[PDB]
Design an enzyme around this catalytic site. Structure first.
Site, PDB file in Angstrom:
ATOM      1  N   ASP A 100       0.889  -1.146   0.000  1.00 22.45           N
ATOM      2  CA  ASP A 100       0.000   0.000   0.000  1.00 22.45           C
ATOM      3  C   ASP A 100       0.943   1.216   0.000  1.00 22.45           C
ATOM      4  O   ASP A 100       1.562   1.528   1.035  1.00 22.45           O
ATOM      5  CB  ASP A 100      -0.939   0.053   1.211  1.00 22.45           C
ATOM      6  CG  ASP A 100      -1.955  -1.087   1.291  1.00 22.45           C
ATOM      7  OD1 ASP A 100      -1.816  -2.168   0.669  1.00 22.45           O
ATOM      8  OD2 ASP A 100      -2.941  -0.871   2.067  1.00 22.45           O
ATOM      9  N   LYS A 165      -7.149   3.487  -2.280  1.00 27.46           N
ATOM     10  CA  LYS A 165      -7.343   3.421  -0.840  1.00 27.46           C
ATOM     11  C   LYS A 165      -7.457   4.837  -0.289  1.00 27.46           C
ATOM     12  O   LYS A 165      -6.739   5.734  -0.726  1.00 27.46           O
ATOM     13  CB  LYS A 165      -6.137   2.680  -0.238  1.00 27.46           C
ATOM     14  CG  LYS A 165      -6.037   2.682   1.297  1.00 27.46           C
ATOM     15  CD  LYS A 165      -4.997   1.664   1.834  1.00 27.46           C
ATOM     16  CE  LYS A 165      -4.607   1.993   3.298  1.00 27.46           C
ATOM     17  NZ  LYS A 165      -3.738   0.924   3.893  1.00 27.46           N
ATOM     18  N   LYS A 199     -10.482   0.388  -1.038  1.00 24.78           N
ATOM     19  CA  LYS A 199     -10.181   0.145   0.380  1.00 24.78           C
ATOM     20  C   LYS A 199     -10.412   1.416   1.180  1.00 24.78           C
ATOM     21  O   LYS A 199      -9.552   2.312   1.201  1.00 24.78           O
ATOM     22  CB  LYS A 199      -8.743  -0.356   0.546  1.00 24.78           C
ATOM     23  CG  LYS A 199      -8.321  -0.604   2.025  1.00 24.78           C
ATOM     24  CD  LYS A 199      -6.960  -1.273   2.095  1.00 24.78           C
ATOM     25  CE  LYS A 199      -6.423  -1.191   3.533  1.00 24.78           C
ATOM     26  NZ  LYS A 199      -5.071  -1.772   3.662  1.00 24.78           N
TER      27      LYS A 199
END
Length: 248
Positions: A100, A165, A199
């Site tokens: 990430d 995300k 996300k």
């Protein structure tokens, strides 16, 4: 309502600890918590140096398929591609299944759209060679503005993000349903729902919160869409709330 949503959400968790002073003991405990009476979380998310001990803990409890995610360029989203790429390469070497990375959102806010493309693309090329998924954190709580949230999402997708995300969890404002709607609309508008997951992360606290985020996904993409390749919750305390809603 809450029981069905909670068992879906639990399965989609990236169960996370990312503290400045984490220990092996805390990561071991987190791995044990990821194996619940009603299901395993999709992943754990930890700093890179904890990947080896987490992998052995997950194997030793018979849950070898819980994925191990980590973070790079984090939490700052600085615009130094060499550092972001070196950190991503190191995370791969530590054994990550997923990385990430933080998008260079302050450079975007200052008018530079290209560095975000180049940074994400470089990190994606390293991850793809290793069969590692790349999620891109755009930091919606600091971008603030809907047009910038859309732009960061679009750049990230164009550059090859496997997920977009919301947030690092390290700033004042992290996921909100508003931000989630905006980002998922970009996935929809760009026609990448098959290849790009979403996300929400940070400040997803309760089973009720999780139910809201899943409702947006189901509305935009259909009830069949969310699954571990397409949806994760970046969260921690949420797990106990989901289990409580489920009678555990």
């Amino acid at each position: 309502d809450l029981k069905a949503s909670s068992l879906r959400a639990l399965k989609l968790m990236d169960l996370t600890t990312l503290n400045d002073d984490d220990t092996d003991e805390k990561v071991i405990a987190l791995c044990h918590q990821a194996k619940t009476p009603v299901g395993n979380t999709a992943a754990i998310c930890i700093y890179p140096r904890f990947i080896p001990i987490a992998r052995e803990t997950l194997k030793e409890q018979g849950t070898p398929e819980i994925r191990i995610a980590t973070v790079t360029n984090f939490p700052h989203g600085n615009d130094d591609i060499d550092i972001a790429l070196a950190e991503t390469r190191a995370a791969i070497a530590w054994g990550a299944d997923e990385v990430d990375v933080v998008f260079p959102y302050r450079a975007l806010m200052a008018g530079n759209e290209q560095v975000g493309f180049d940074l994400v693309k470089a990190c994606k090329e390293a991850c793809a060679a290793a069969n590692v998924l790349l999620k891109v954190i755009i930091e919606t709580g600091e971008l603030k503005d809907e047009a910038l949230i859309r732009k960061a999402s679009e750049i990230s997708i164009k550059a090859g993000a496997d997920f977009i995300k919301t947030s690092t969890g390290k700033v004042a404002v992290n996921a909100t349903p508003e931000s989630a709607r905006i980002m998922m609309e970009v996935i929809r508008d760009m026609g990448v729902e098959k290849t790009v997951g979403f996300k929400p992360a940070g400040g997803v606290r309760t089973a009720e919160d999780a139910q809201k985020y899943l409702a947006i996904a189901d509305e935009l993409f259909g009830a069949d869409w969310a699954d571990a390749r397409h949806y994760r919750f970046g969260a921690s305390s949420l797990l106990a709330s989901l289990l409580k809603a489920l009678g555990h």
